[PDB]
Amino acid sequence: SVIRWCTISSPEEKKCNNLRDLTQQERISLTCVQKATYLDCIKAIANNEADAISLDGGQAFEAGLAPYKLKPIAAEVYEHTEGSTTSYYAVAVVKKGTEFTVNDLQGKTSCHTGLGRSAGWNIPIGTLLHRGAIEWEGIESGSVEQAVAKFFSASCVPGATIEQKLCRQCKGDPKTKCARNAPYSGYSGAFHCLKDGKGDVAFVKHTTVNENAPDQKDEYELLCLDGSRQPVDNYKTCNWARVAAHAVVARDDNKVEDIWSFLSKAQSDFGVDTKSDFHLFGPPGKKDPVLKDLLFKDSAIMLKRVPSLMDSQLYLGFEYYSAIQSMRKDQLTPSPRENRIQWCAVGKDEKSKCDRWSVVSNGDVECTVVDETKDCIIKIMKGEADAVALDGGLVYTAGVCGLVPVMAERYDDESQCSKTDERPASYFAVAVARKDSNVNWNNLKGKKSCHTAVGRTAGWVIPMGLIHNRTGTCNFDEYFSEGCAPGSPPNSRLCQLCQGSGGIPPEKCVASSHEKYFGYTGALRCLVEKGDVAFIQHSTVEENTGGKNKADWAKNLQMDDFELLCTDGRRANVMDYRECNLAEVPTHAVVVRPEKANKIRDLLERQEKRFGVNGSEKSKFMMFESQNKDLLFKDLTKCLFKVREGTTYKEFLGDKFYTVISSLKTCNPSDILQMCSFLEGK
Ligand SMILES: [Fe+3]
Ligand SMILES: [Fe+3]
């Protein structure tokens, strides 16, 4: 196509154009739209007049807000000693020998990169708001601009519309001087501000003294939040925050595909290892402040692509996003919560059981309904729901996204969740077949398979990881004729035995209880009315036979109709899961953000007293009851036990299990796993 990069200063526009000419005879090409501001570029990308632009984390928060809904497409990478992550560190630079601490900043003069930028404004002013030095309570006590103008004696905050005091130390002419591209703008202009004696403090990133005064580094210090002062190189132990990198945003559409093609071209041709006169990232030399950080920051070394599930809210993190909002609303007022556990139900039957839970607890629990169980993960990460109970396979995924197992399911007896005088708790993964059949473990190829869902412990992680040991492929779709493994791609072989809903919009091969064949009992039902194997839990056959499941298909079933398949030998008795299983796996657990673990552990124990297996109001509601549909919780559950504080998903899951998912993930990784893997490697 011709990618329309938006620029915001006449030097940037000028660089934009040298790249138009070096790419002018290529497949993906370029134009360089120049507007007066970065917001004027956000509007032009939202109105199809330009296509891309790289924005500071605080401006990436604005681009993602409606009407605009602009997405993170690409992210800058920085030289890290850890790795080379897509984040940087905000630091506050002062001169060696001035005596003040972070506690003495009142009355001083300050130099900021820009109003609303992360290191230059959001992190310092938000941090001072929270320590109690800048006194702001919420928008009803003034703007943040008025609150800072009473703290600092004069500042240069190139962006300030309201207070004139924030433009007083700025350098340049009577109109242009307090603009976002003025000489004292950006990380280096704010550094020159300090170097020229105009600020006592400069709020910049961890690389700024090295980008503008490398031999003069010994004349400068950093202000640490513990009251101390350290050297400019000790930023890793003396920073104010680690923030998300600057990111290339764009309209969420087909053009995205080309914006990355173009950028991966110039990364390869014009990067850090280049020999041309065109440098895309840099070079980071001492230079005029106005020629610094054009189009991309001089500190970038390459671009990394953000996975498509991401949105600004998700890119910036819960802690930082919640900070930019703080500075837009009074604290008491939208902040009551710790009295209500917002549970996340998946699909319609789980929505029904949760609304009764919410009616019968006179409100102590409320419900969010989603469609897939990956949506619950995202809702909890964003602070829009608080807990959900997930399977061992799906706890791995939440564990990569930073959620923690706070309570887990105990499948044996009711009194056993009070334990000193025993520890552990697990269930078993199993291969079930009908006794008439010819199939055994090694006969398993080219057959029909029934799976609880793609992604889950017993019905996919254990079986596919043993078929992946032998097969050496991540194409289990070619290892059967067909199956029903809900959640797979809709037009494949593992979708064909699946039935769908009643059959109204029909929804087959979906990962909720709308699909007939979903979960442990839906996959016994697949074995029974259509397939060769059912990859299930050890008790799925006892629970649905001997007359206990009173549905059509299950009315007549007895446990003599089936047999297990051991990794090898025989076929075995369905009640010998101990000796003929595929694995002993950890149980299902409730996973929450680490800071909400206290509330919901306590709010959930109150709830099981009233509706647990020996609840006091069982009569109205029993929590681990669903009609063999394992709604909200598994039906086998006798009680729920507390998982000790500071337990990591890896420790809960066990090392034996931790290994298996870290084998199948070289095979096709889900879009949620990839997104969260960008954030843990951020
Ligand atoms: Fe920045
Ligand atoms: Fe399970």
Side-chain angles (χ1 to χ4, degrees):
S1 305
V2 60
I3 266 61
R4 299 161 284 173
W5 208 272
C6 205
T7 66
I8 58 205
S9 66
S10 307
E12 188 161 64
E13 160 65 296
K14 214 248 232 290
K15 174 177 185 172
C16 191
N17 290 135
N18 283 216
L19 191 50
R20 147 146 61 60
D21 308 338
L22 270 34
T23 63
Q24 204 87 87
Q25 315 128 318
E26 270 288 317
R27 189 176 64 67
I28 327 84
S29 270
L30 190 78
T31 325
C32 298
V33 184
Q34 191 255 236
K35 305 289 176 198
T37 240
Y38 74 95
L39 198 45
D40 283 26
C41 280
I42 284 172
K43 296 178 150 179
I45 290 186
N47 294 143
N48 203 299
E49 283 181 43
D51 288 321
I53 187 176
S54 204
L55 242 36
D56 171 74
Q59 307 167 155
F61 168 98
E62 284 165 58
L65 229 43
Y68 319 127
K69 281 158 188 265
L70 261 21
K71 208 89 166 163
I73 248 69
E76 273 170 25
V77 179
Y78 300 113
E79 292 147 329
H80 260 283
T81 82
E82 284 58 65
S84 259
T85 63
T86 54
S87 55
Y88 53 108
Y89 293 101
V91 108
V93 201
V94 292
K95 304 235 179 76
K96 185 165 178 72
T98 53
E99 333 276 339
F100 66 91
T101 77
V102 60
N103 296 315
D104 293 295
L105 289 167
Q106 198 208 300
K108 309 285 181 291
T109 82
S110 65
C111 298
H112 301 260
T113 65
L115 179 86
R117 278 174 60 167
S118 322
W121 191 251
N122 295 346
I123 296 299
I125 301 312
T127 299
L128 245 25
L129 257 65
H130 256 266
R131 294 176 68 94
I134 290 180
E135 208 171 81
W136 198 69
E137 310 295 279
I139 58 132
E140 296 228 349
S141 53
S143 46
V144 190
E145 287 206 31
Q146 170 206 319
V148 178
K150 294 170 194 171
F151 188 65
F152 288 140
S153 70
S155 300
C156 172
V157 178
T161 32
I162 304 167
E163 271 284 339
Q164 304 74 295
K165 255 184 156 176
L166 298 193
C167 296
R168 208 127 95 167
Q169 307 310 84
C170 290
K171 190 162 88 172
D173 187 86
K175 340 91 189 183
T176 67
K177 71 148 188 178
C178 196
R180 298 186 113 109
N181 52 202
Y184 279 169
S185 80
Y187 304 95
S188 290
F191 172 77
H192 279 217
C193 178
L194 197 243
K195 215 191 82 279
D196 289 3
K198 285 304 195 288
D200 288 292
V201 224
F203 293 103
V204 293
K205 65 180 288 172
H206 64 287
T207 64
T208 315
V209 178
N210 229 70
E211 275 187 80
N212 307 272
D215 316 315
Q216 278 71 70
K217 263 164 53 171
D218 54 345
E219 294 176 34
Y220 292 104
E221 266 163 327
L222 305 178
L223 236 46
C224 315
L225 295 168
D226 64 344
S228 78
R229 266 171 183 232
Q230 255 150 101
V232 157
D233 288 326
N234 284 45
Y235 59 95
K236 218 171 275 148
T237 67
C238 179
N239 59 85
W240 285 37
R242 189 185 184 125
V243 288
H246 276 221
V248 182
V249 307
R251 292 170 314 275
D252 185 8
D253 58 51
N254 54 330
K255 256 281 194 54
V256 162
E257 207 52 57
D258 299 332
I259 304 178
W260 180 249
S261 299
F262 188 91
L263 287 180
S264 191
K265 136 234 265 69
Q267 280 205 78
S268 288
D269 303 317
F270 313 112
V272 276
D273 67 323
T274 203
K275 260 302 173 76
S276 165
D277 301 342
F278 201 73
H279 290 82
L280 195 60
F281 307 123
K286 208 302 185 177
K287 211 166 277 278
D288 188 297
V290 179
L291 270 134
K292 304 278 286 160
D293 303 321
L294 303 176
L295 248 11
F296 297 102
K297 284 166 59 167
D298 312 325
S299 37
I301 59 169
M302 64 167 102
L303 295 153
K304 189 182 179 173
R305 209 211 196 305
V306 197
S308 269
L309 216 56
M310 286 258 219
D311 47 50
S312 46
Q313 182 166 7
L314 226 38
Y315 179 72
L316 302 186
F318 187 69
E319 289 69 26
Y320 190 42
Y321 196 90
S322 294
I324 307 171
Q325 302 282 30
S326 290
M327 279 180 267
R328 304 182 153 222
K329 43 211 147 184
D330 309 85
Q331 191 51 242
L332 311 58
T333 329
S335 316
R337 290 177 298 195
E338 289 69 46
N339 28 282
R340 259 139 244 194
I341 164 179
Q342 189 84 7
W343 209 267
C344 184
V346 184
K348 285 169 175 130
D349 305 311
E350 284 205 350
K351 167 56 171 173
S352 179
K353 191 182 174 180
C354 195
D355 284 329
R356 198 173 56 133
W357 194 6
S358 82
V359 174
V360 100
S361 74
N362 285 63
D364 291 315
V365 52
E366 234 306 84
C367 320
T368 296
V369 57
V370 291
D371 295 335
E372 292 262 309
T373 81
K374 56 126 172 144
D375 292 10
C376 283
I377 293 176
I378 280 157
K379 271 192 175 290
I380 299 172
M381 280 167 70
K382 298 191 165 184
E384 293 184 331
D386 295 330
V388 71
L390 297 172
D391 165 73
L394 268 141
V395 172
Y396 179 81
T397 302
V400 171
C401 310
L403 311 191
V404 286
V406 91
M407 275 172 116
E409 281 176 355
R410 178 131 207 129
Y411 303 128
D412 36 60
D413 200 283
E414 201 285 294
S415 55
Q416 256 265 279
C417 291
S418 296
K419 48 186 180 180
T420 307
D421 292 74
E422 203 206 278
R423 312 220 97 196
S426 143
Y427 65 97
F428 296 83
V430 144
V432 195
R434 42 225 296 198
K435 51 77 228 167
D436 43 279
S437 264
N438 209 211
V439 69
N440 59 95
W441 185 249
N442 287 288
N443 206 338
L444 244 65
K445 200 260 159 56
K447 300 310 147 71
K448 310 290 200 308
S449 52
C450 299
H451 297 287
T452 63
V454 44
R456 292 181 62 154
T457 320
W460 185 269
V461 166
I462 296 293
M464 299 298 108
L466 270 173
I467 276 80
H468 179 71
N469 197 85
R470 173 221 313 222
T471 277
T473 312
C474 299
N475 204 355
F476 308 105
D477 138 68
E478 292 189 13
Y479 185 91
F480 292 116
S481 53
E482 54 229 290
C484 182
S488 292
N491 277 10
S492 73
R493 301 313 299 219
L494 292 311
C495 280
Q496 296 204 120
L497 307 192
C498 301
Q499 246 84 269
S501 186
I504 286 180
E507 306 166 293
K508 68 140 92 63
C509 216
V510 289
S512 70
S513 59
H514 292 208
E515 168 46 67
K516 284 191 184 73
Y517 292 158
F518 178 84
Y520 305 109
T521 302
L524 224 200
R525 181 168 196 197
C526 175
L527 168 75
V528 155
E529 66 171 62
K530 235 289 89 221
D532 277 272
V533 224
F535 288 108
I536 237 76
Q537 184 202 187
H538 74 99
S539 55
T540 302
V541 163
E542 191 179 289
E543 301 177 81
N544 299 304
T545 67
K548 277 190 295 294
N549 182 16
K550 292 204 78 195
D552 62 298
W553 63 280
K555 192 201 173 183
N556 273 152
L557 269 57
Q558 50 184 272
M559 61 178 81
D560 295 65
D561 310 316
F562 317 100
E563 285 180 285
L564 306 186
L565 320 180
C566 328
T567 352
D568 235 13
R570 63 292 183 203
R571 286 193 45 152
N573 179 181
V574 146
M575 287 288 276
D576 309 336
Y577 42 87
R578 290 258 163 203
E579 197 188 56
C580 183
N581 60 65
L582 304 199
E584 176 169 22
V585 292
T587 75
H588 296 200
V590 185
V591 303
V592 300
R593 313 195 100 253
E595 63 263 15
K596 283 222 164 173
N598 264 324
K599 180 182 132 181
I600 85 108
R601 205 188 256 115
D602 268 19
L603 292 203
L604 196 57
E605 243 197 6
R606 285 165 74 172
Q607 289 287 316
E608 192 184 358
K609 231 285 181 167
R610 300 212 277 156
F611 311 106
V613 147
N614 289 315
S616 88
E617 274 134 88
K618 299 194 281 184
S619 53
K620 294 140 173 176
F621 186 62
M622 210 302 259
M623 290 166 72
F624 312 121
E625 178 223 275
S626 83
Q627 296 287 88
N628 313 89
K629 238 183 187 184
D630 294 307
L631 265 33
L632 279 326
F633 295 100
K634 274 196 181 175
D635 304 319
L636 252 200
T637 325
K638 269 70 188 178
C639 55
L640 216 57
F641 66 86
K642 284 178 176 184
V643 192
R644 185 225 88 209
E645 189 89 45
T647 306
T648 229
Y649 71 106
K650 201 295 184 60
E651 287 152 5
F652 184 78
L653 292 173
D655 180 87
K656 301 133 301 295
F657 186 75
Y658 184 73
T659 303
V660 184
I661 337 96
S662 287
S663 286
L664 280 309
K665 282 304 166 279
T666 23
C667 299
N668 268 299
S670 57
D671 54 359
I672 183 74
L673 208 345
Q674 297 177 28
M675 182 249 273
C676 285
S677 244
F678 179 88
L679 299 176
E680 196 193 23
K682 216 192 188 311

